[PDB]
Design goal:
Elements lengths: L33 H16 L9 H6 L15 H11 L34 E2 L14 E5 L7 H15 L2 E5 L14 E2 L9 E12 L5 E8 L11 E5 L13 E5 L1 E2 L4
Parallel strand pairs: 4-7
Antiparallel strand pairs: 1-9, 2-8, 3-5, 3-8, 5-6, 6-7
The protein binds calcium ion (CA) (2 copies) and chloride ion.
């Protein structure tokens, strides 16, 4: 456990027995549903950390079940904030097996929950506790932006490492264009700047130290994508945590963590 994930190196995928290593990469297909895949994976790793089986959440249920005006669920992505609202409104997260994903079904009518379906949110609670001496906590999520940490990136890194260790992952936002280069196939540590904005949710799942092609000691994030297991390096990639020195923007735009109460299994 600790030898696979500590403050200097964390790669749970190298422990074939780890619950988290048994959460296989998924393929969102040709809809903008990464917000669902990354958010649900964060709950899946939290469940693993609390001793539950690596059972997948139905992304399709979350895509299709919502209150209010009709939405454009294939063409337009939403946010981790909305993901939590759907949980609050419905109280039920079916398993993938009960309502499995096909991107062509994103937007269809929300299905009836059948009697035999599993609720992977049973005894879960999103926390809205008001603990800090300010009115801004208790939203159910906490978000950090690399631009706000531009003069203190060591603290941004430490926050993410702590959450990866404790929750198994964080949600991270990137600009999808940035991983579209031919070079993102393969096993090298990528090194590049981000943009002013982001549009695609992924997960940071680990990290480590390495030496770059210029002989400099550096560090990388291990990032999970939702473009299937033939994209990148078996569905994941490594990216330099700091990137080129000239960058105005970090490759990681922002991270989100969910604040939930879930009893140990
Ligand atoms: Ca760019
Ligand atoms: Ca910006
Ligand atoms: Cl749509």
């Amino acid at each position: 456990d600790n030898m696979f994930c500590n403050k200097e190196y964390c790669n749970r995928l190298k422990d074939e027995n780890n619950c988290i290593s048994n959460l296989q990469v998924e393929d969102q297909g040709n809809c903008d549903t990464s917000w669902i895949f990354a958010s649900k994976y964060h709950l899946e790793t939290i469940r693993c950390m609390k001793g539950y089986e690596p059972t997948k959440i139905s992304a399709l249920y979350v895509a299709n079940c919502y209150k209010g005006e009709h939405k454009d669920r294939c063409d337009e992505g939403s946010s981790p904030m909305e993901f939590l609202q759907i949980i609050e409104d419905y109280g039920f997260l079916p398993a993938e097996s009960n309502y499995p994903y096909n991107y062509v079904k994103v937007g269809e009518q929300c299905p009836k929950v059948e009697d035999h379906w599993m609720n992977l949110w049973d005894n879960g609670k999103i926390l809205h506790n008001k603990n800090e001496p300010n009115s801004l906590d208790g939203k159910g999520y906490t978000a950090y932006e690399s631009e706000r940490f531009h003069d203190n990136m060591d603290a941004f890194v430490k926050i993410i490492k702590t959450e990866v260790m404790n929750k198994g992952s964080v949600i991270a936002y990137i600009k999808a264009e940035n991983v579209m280069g031919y070079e993102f196939s393969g096993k090298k540590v990528q090194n590049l700047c981000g943009d002013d904005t982001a549009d695609h949710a992924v997960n940071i799942v680990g990290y480590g130290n390495y030496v770059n092609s210029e002989g400099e000691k550096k560090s990388y994030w291990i990032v999970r994508n939702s473009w299937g297991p033939y994209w990148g390096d078996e569905g994941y990639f490594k990216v330099d945590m700091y990137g080129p020195t000239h960058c105005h923007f970090n490759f990681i735009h922002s991270v989100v963590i969910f604040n939930v109460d879930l009893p140990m299994n």
